[PDB]
């Protein structure tokens, strides 16, 4: 077994690669027609689905650069959003890259405020989207909910040039956590991870993890070792809700079990308005330790 | 003028955008089906499309690595071939990765023959694809023959974790053809397109700006004569470039925006494959290159 031959478990598990497709087709458009794609997205998709609010550290840590673009004339401001769309190396590019994604979509989530009372620079009046741009605009709107607030991350969080993240926040109270129920699984380590992230305790999550294991998110790498696992924990995952429904449980290779769970999970973006259609795939070694997990944001509900 | 806001010049032009949103599924994909994917796209087009043999230059720039896999017993063999998919980091996967895209693809076709003779180990007997890998293997068989050569490419380029081809010698001058254009007589234009035809890249750098910039297809813009140059010399001999017609408008700052469009055809194929191909040029007023565009087209439609 290696991390990433470990990749190919359950080959059957149909993820929704088109996200990746249409942030890769997304990736070759104009600046500008990047801009107002996500603009267009953004506007649209708010009528029915509002975006929580940035916390406070968030907004204080990104605080600094939105004064800046704020005090630009409208040609700078809009030239410095074409910058981090490029990925053009400036200073402001290079601050944004140190951000964590949840500081970067803080950053955009205010300046669309901004935009929507100008204060700073919209997308121009009339504008037409280009061809390849239209399509892909078209594509986005087609998606799931789950789907499409993915690809509008991805693309949020690739801008800039490539750290600050939002504090730590504590455990929940042991008396007060909640308990996972999985259809045909009672595997401790399964239910155990589910729950001590639930309850954002990643110090006793990470305790769950083969020194060399592995967590894959949707559509990213493999993140090896405890080390980069707990970063990547306490960067990026606190407050989520995972709602697991069923699983099934296999032997592997080696005194190896490998367990596939389907369920819902919740980003505090959006809560209970969109239930995200995921897929978890455990390997686990023989004394239970998570060797490999991915997380797989499934292609339909067909899926589950 | 920016190089970034040229990249925004005729947004009508419908790229083939199909082609990086395939690669990008791709590349989700489990290194042995990405290997098994590639390996069956291969032996079907290769039935009614031959690959030319790879130069002799590139074999023996190739050879050391392709011994060293070849003295591998089989599973060794298949992990070597597993490491450059998952861009490993590897000495094997470094040498990879120091190549030119002709290099890596020559390697390739190397290993393809020995796989079909049995001498390295080939995808196991019987192998099925995963879900997702089927569906983009089913994708890449709808493509026309120039989306499908170029998703094969680029996912051949993209493995691994400043080794070239020698520059071949330009085209004798008396032996030089010149293109036509419907609708264009612009100097600029057509010396580019005769240039580059003739494997003149020394003149050919000469049209451009010291800032100006080429963008190949589904790529970011190369910036600058330097950098420029190198790509020409290395990835860039023996094209046919066969452009069609074109439209000339002006452009800001007494700029001038040129599309064309027509086929090309790379060594690699011949005149088996023809693909549709669009250049959007900006030049400045004195009829240098700021910025030039090269776009696979979505359709003989484009
Ligand atoms: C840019 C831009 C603009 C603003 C755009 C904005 C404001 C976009 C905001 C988008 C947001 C807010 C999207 C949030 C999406 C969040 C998602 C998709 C979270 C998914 C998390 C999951 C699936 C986690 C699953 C996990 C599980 C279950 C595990 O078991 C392990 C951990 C982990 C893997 C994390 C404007 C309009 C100005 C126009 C100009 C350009
Ligand atoms: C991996 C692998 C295998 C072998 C795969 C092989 C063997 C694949 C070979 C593929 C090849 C040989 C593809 C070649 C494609 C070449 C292309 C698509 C060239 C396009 C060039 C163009 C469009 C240039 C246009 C330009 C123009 C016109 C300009 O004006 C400026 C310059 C430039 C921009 C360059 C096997 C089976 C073992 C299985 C295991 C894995």
Redesign the pocket.
Known sequence: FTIDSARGIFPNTLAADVVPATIARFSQLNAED??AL??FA??EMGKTLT?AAPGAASMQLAENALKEIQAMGPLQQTQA?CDL?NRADTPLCRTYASWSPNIK?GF??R??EL?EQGFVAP?PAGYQLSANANAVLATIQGLES?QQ??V??N??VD?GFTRIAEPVVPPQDTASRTKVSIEGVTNATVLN?MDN?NANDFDTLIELFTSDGA?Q??FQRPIVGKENVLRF?RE??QN?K?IPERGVTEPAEDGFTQIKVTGK?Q?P??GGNVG?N?A?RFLLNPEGKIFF?A?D?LASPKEL
Do not use: N
């Open positions: 990047q801009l996500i603009w953004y506007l975006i959003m769309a979509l955009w989530y300046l669309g935009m997308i789950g607030i993915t509008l991350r693309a949020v801008m991870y992230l967590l998110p949707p924990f990026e995952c989520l995972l999970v980003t973006w959006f995200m995921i978890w997990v997380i944001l």
